[model samples]
Target: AQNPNCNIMIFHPTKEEFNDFDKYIAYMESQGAHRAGLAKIIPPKEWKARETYDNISEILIATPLQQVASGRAGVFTQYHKKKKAMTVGEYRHLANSKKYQTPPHQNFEDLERKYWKNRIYNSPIYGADISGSLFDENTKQWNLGHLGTIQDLLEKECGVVIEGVNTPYLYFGMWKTTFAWHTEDMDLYSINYLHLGEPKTWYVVPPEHGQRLERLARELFPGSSRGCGAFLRHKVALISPTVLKENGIPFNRITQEAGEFMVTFPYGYHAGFNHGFNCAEAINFATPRWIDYGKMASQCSCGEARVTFSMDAFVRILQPERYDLWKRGQ
Candidate 1:
């Protein structure tokens, strides 16, 4: 079956338009692109990748998940699940291997219930903190620290440098390797640049459908919900768009290609899988509007606190003079 087409707006920003990040976002807002909770930006072909993709020989641990395990809200949450260290080249070889790319597709509910499963494991290198790494230092246009749109607000205003959120992280993905439904930490906006390789398929729930998505997720995973109101933050839940549509939650599908950028809005719920071997860099950033979301995210929906960066410290640093007092009080 042909997949559903992406209904989100795809912007082709000129060099001038893309360079002015603030103005670009303003234009995006005016176009109501944020309504979909995600947008794709195609930069000019002249933009070159800073990382030497061909020479990466670093050995990193990768997590492999069963492709069909999350059939309907029943799979082990991937907290400390499985890890195997492999060189970038070795993983890429396994990822691109024919056997790994093709898997049995027939389904029997009884079989699934009986624990029959496919051999395809979605191996992914997740949350590789590349901050201060040579790749980060060399990347210019999308560098988290210097990206003018979010730079002033996160580090300059808050005076805090959170690794994954502020410093940027690298992700390596292969066929069917997935990132399940979740919002950015602190509900900040996130920008993902596909540095190289095959396109990724993204599924995003619209902003208006955000609450419904959360409610449905909780209903689907009652145990996890009972454990923590922010259970989805664990990045363990996966829902097919078919199920989302059946449940009346509006979603947009995006095929983000190489050299393109995907920007997710605050509080947006997004999930996706890689089409093939790919390398991407992503980071969370904030605008003035993220303050309320940050406050809400600081404490999970219930009284259970999410183990995230301290919003109190972030708010305190908004006024550098008060930072001294905040420290003294601490």
Candidate 2:
């Protein structure tokens, strides 16, 4: 397959470039690194303290409306256990139906609206993972299921081993909607990439900025906890980076259209909005390697077992040596 436009210049730093942590920092700084502009949008009081880590916790929430079931091995096992055999479409519809309804305690739509209303405090580089439907009866696995592949690629690119147990499950869905934004257990560098679809508006702010907004919300409305006043709110301030439009940046929208990509560096607070209506599909990968602090922090305790269908496998297929490089980091 020919390379897509967006991924043509996707950044793949040589081992030497990543090996020299200080030089990497200097390079990012020279490129105009700063807290993402999304910080200025939120009122200063709402910003929270920088919890425990200097490295910002990155979050990538892709809307995998159709690909959810195909990429998820656990979900597939569960479905087959009950019905013997089920088509991808059948499983997806069932999952979506279960996700859309209120779970006795709360309604899905209500929760979604509430979450969107809150400003995002962390910078999230956004991206899409796009594909059409496919059927493969011989393997009983949906083809073009690329989430695992993307994850593998990201792991190799970042050079951090994904640790934890029970981590190989492939059940995909609108997970971001349910995930709450707090800090990861350790200091980590993170970012998101959009592979398909148009941009979506994302608000990101620093902890200090979020704290100021929180205080104002409480004082202005007293008893009201809706909007910015809600403590569980995941809203953050964010702005698009100039690199987004610059000709040379790897993930620039105008430059690449598909494949693996990343946006590292914590300065210049940022967030983004999709250019189209439907949510874009993209793989999100992060490692615990916090270069700014010059050390490996906590591993993702979510589980240590690696996902079998990850981008690491893809690297092994395309560039075996790169896969070996990632193994050394592990």
Candidate 3:
């Protein structure tokens, strides 16, 4: 019952060092952080963090245990499936209620599959509008829209908040709660900041192994992968790292703690589970390098209805130098 012990690259940047978000990301990439598909950034210790926000008491979507265990928690459930609505306060109570603690006889995979029925795990409020949520704070340097942030580049294009892509969305976590294996929308880079919570364990396959992971997924779940160009986008595919490694795909496992930012490279496949009750915010972003990936992006089909942002529109708003880069591609 040995577990994987690999760690992703961790960056400890000073407040001044990270002032220019773009510069910091470039520095991280230069350090070969991108090679691991995922990297952790620990902000300066003196940085301010808000503990409680105004909207925790408000209702949010919560899916049943079976949906989460099956990795279909947040996917388009047009098949007569049902979900619940609960406040963070109520979910916290349920999560912390008299459930059997960890270190049980069963491993996590066994526990989820064999014993975790009849409970509710919130389907992580993905791409949720945070117009007035506690996470709406824009002054913090880690804020997705803060100046120099990678997502800030989108401001020059649409002058709008593209929730989940440009705008941050909140995630509530409990023991063994999971996000299945998937890449960010449009193959864009993504960053998840743990505002407050227990650690989250992430398994990431490098960009080079991205195809291998997809192939393995298809081989394992033919039904889910059949006819869907972007079946993983459904976020309903959860293959254990053990299985991935058994199939010859290399991956890195890392634990992200509160106040730390975990950045996933473009097209790098990743999935993770929560250790306990926690809250996190995540959003997608882009860099000049992302344009190439965007050019190659394909709309997810097979009944998935989310529309991707126009890469052409993004090219139109780029600075002349970057625009020229796109032209060179054409």
Candidate 4:
């Protein structure tokens, strides 16, 4: 079948089947889900007993039920131990502050410039709380490690690939937070699964229209660091399953009544908004592409020396029989 600008596949399992989740768990285990060395976990279908079947259904609609899995929900939540209320402006300021240091080799602006070029608003930008404040913990050594484990597991068990493992970077943002539209680094693919609260809306554009939009963004947002080149960028708007239907963009309108659903983005301009009054959480797993990782260590904005660890490791792991194919650049 010809691939679309985006793809959405859905799976519905019986209640009894879900109750016997062990079958799926065992399947994942046998496939080396844990040993694969990527992020893997079983997250609660409900949070604080507040999530309803409809809520779960909405998540499932956004992401398919089959791709949804249990995982650690507390990782980001723990960072906000104080749960002190703060305005979006205050949070954004703090996230972009000099005190908020990115990883050793990563510079916020350099990365933005390298990947986004003139598409995004500025050279360096950061998510307010979700990526920065909520998930950043200097004290814990296992946060990224845990994510690595999950990433590996997903790749091995589900044929899902991820990039930037050793050099993982995350941005923190809030519900209803608006980011100028832009696509990811490469023609990346992603699946978004929610664990708490509902996103009001998710905006997406076709890849065919990306270039023109990129030019438009550059002209309007200009030097402000907005725009995502020509690729589609997602943004949060309002909850409306009908939009997906009308646009022929697949989506599920699950509520507290149903289980979790995931939103898949093969290559499209997309954005999201949080509809719930309180904070919500989401987990994303993306496929790895060479372009995204190629320049990781080249920018050198974070004072870290470049290394070829990933390339070396990948070459070493290449199957012996595939040598000829590799030499041919396939």
Candidate 5:
């Protein structure tokens, strides 16, 4: 918030630069800061959408596709639970005989269009939960999601306490599937890698001015709670970057392309819209510099209890005086 130019920043990193983990962190923390950009970064190898589902099918085929209903336009126009939209798995299964699902052999784009025309959304393709599971029974699918690579270094470099934090989710985005304005869970940082897609556009508000955005939102929405999932589960109002700018809260407008690594800073409030069909993967981890904001998150949002975050855990990661007590418990 101090830097007037602290609007969304986008950078293109060379292969050499992207490969050096610590250097990459430096670039992210400094240049892009709270912006979204398509990184020239690739995973250890190519992990395209079709291959990802094909290879991991043995384990995750049963994992339900997270979908919600929106009308033909696809944005958060509707939130009532019972809607025509069905989970991707259920749609594929019932389209065939009971319990039989042969993966569709259609163009990914074609399938995506059909997917949108059919159910209206692919929604947040979650249930990947890979990093959180520690690669135990579910094998790690490599050559994809570059930031997951940084997550490997998080505890060593950032003092991020684990457990529920490592739960990485996949995204199969279709038009109108929107993530309303909110900070990342626990106000920790989240990295979204768009492996392939049309482009996921983002509207980001800096963490410093987060309160200003909320105050304006309250005035506009009239009685809307600035609570968790209020903006999500209910087809709550979504502020456009333009509206934010008009209201004097500047925001970064990013159209994330494939192979881009988009990093949302710790506690930076962001909302996104899937322009068309795309595939993305996201993982959450805390930086050594992130605990203060987790405390801030507890203060700013009053939502579900657990979602308030256990800032108590990471109370002393930077200090050795707490020893085991504060040795990084976020």
Candidate 6:
């Protein structure tokens, strides 16, 4: 689905899936959810976590994730309220409404895109379905290697993942770059590993409180006749965590450092902002118990092709004895 003039949502292709299949499956089977809401894997602050692709910012300048479309090709695209579309490449400028004067939300307008463009942007751009970030196929490649060198661990754990869902949507965040509130696609699980950059701050609402969060967005934003507000028409925004916390909505907050991994469970409403230039990549996948959420989340643009293959794998990988586990799909 086309992102509705917001910085949060977007879509992509699936052929790239088969090519990056094994690696993603390996991660799914190996590092699959072992805990809860926005679970994290953080190393000691002083110690450098990722050994390979030591300098993510340095490498991005030469990668397609930061190059304009003509001289190169990429799955990366970015959003601006006034522009038709913007390339994720750090070298291009995006149009912005000069008279834009929205209160409460000082973001989503007058972005750092032009400023970010002048520098060799040291971050990943959203919309990059990077196969490299999936496996790297080499020693610690730069495609979001936050779980630094975990490929060997996955193999050792016998992560024989014939299927699971982890789509590597590359994220390049600059100062104030943010993700508005939303649930994971298909209500599936997700893992976001920050390869490198300034710490990112995240806010969340519990899975059980999704409706509560949705109501709050509509009530709070209730856009003007022009349908303009802190949120996109999609009902999400770079909402302030303090606002929710004070309202007693139970919004949880966290700051993620580079080389750390953040995991979100099914249907958890989540949002965040980048502190500075940050390069991160994330993917989506499902767990056995997640089947019930499938039909509901599928309405949110979970890839049609990928879901079909996942169903095939589910049948092929499991025998009827496990059918009882999935027979109750909603």
Alpha-carbon lDDT, every model: 0.64, 0.28, 0.63, 0.31, 0.49, 0.45
lDDT: which is higher, 3 or 6?
3
Question: Can you rank all candidates by TM-score, best first?
Answer: 1, 3, 5, 6, 4, 2
Clashes of each: 0, 81, 0, 72, 4, 7
Better of 3 and 4 by TM-score: 3
- Tens digit per residue, CA lDDT, model 1, 257-321: 88888999888889876766778877777776666676565223333333334444553544445
Model 2 lDDT tens row, 1-330: 222221212234454454443354345434433232111111123222123322211222233332111112111100011122333344334334544322331543343343233323211111222232111223221112222333343456666455322121122222222222222222223333232222233333332233443343344334333432232222221112232223222222221122222333322122333222222222222332233321222122122213233433434443454456444433
Backbone clash pairs for candidate 5 read: 38-260, 39-260, 45-143, 74-176
Deviation in Å, model 3, residue 49 alpha carbon: 2.5
lDDT, candidate 3, residue 167? 49
lDDT of 3 by residue, 24-65 (tens): 888888777887788899989867555455456555645434
Better of 1 and 2 by TM-score: 1
Model 6: C-alpha RMSD to truth? 13.2
lDDT of 6 by residue, 1-330 (tens): 221121221112133332352354334334432222455544334333235654343223223332221110111122333222344433122111221111133443222323223222222233234434623544332234433222232223435455433336666655445465767644666778787656677766656566666666666555421242212223224445445665666556667777776767677778765655556778665554455554344231212112333443343333334334333331
Instruction: Name the lDDT value of residue 272 in candidate 4.
Output: 41
Provide the lDDT at 82 for model 5.
Answer: 26
Candidate 3 runs further than 4 Å off: 1-7, 51-55, 58-81, 100-138, 145-165, 305-330
| Cα TM-score per model | 0.75, 0.29, 0.74, 0.36, 0.61, 0.51
Candidate 1 segments exceeding 4 Å error:
1-7, 59-80, 102-139, 148-165, 298-312, 315-330
lDDT of 6: 0.45
Task: Rank the models by lDDT, top first.
Answer: 1, 3, 5, 6, 4, 2
In TM-score terms, which candidate is top? Answer: 1
Better of 1 and 6 by lDDT: 1
* Per-model RMSD to reference: 6.9, 18.0, 7.3, 15.8, 8.2, 13.2
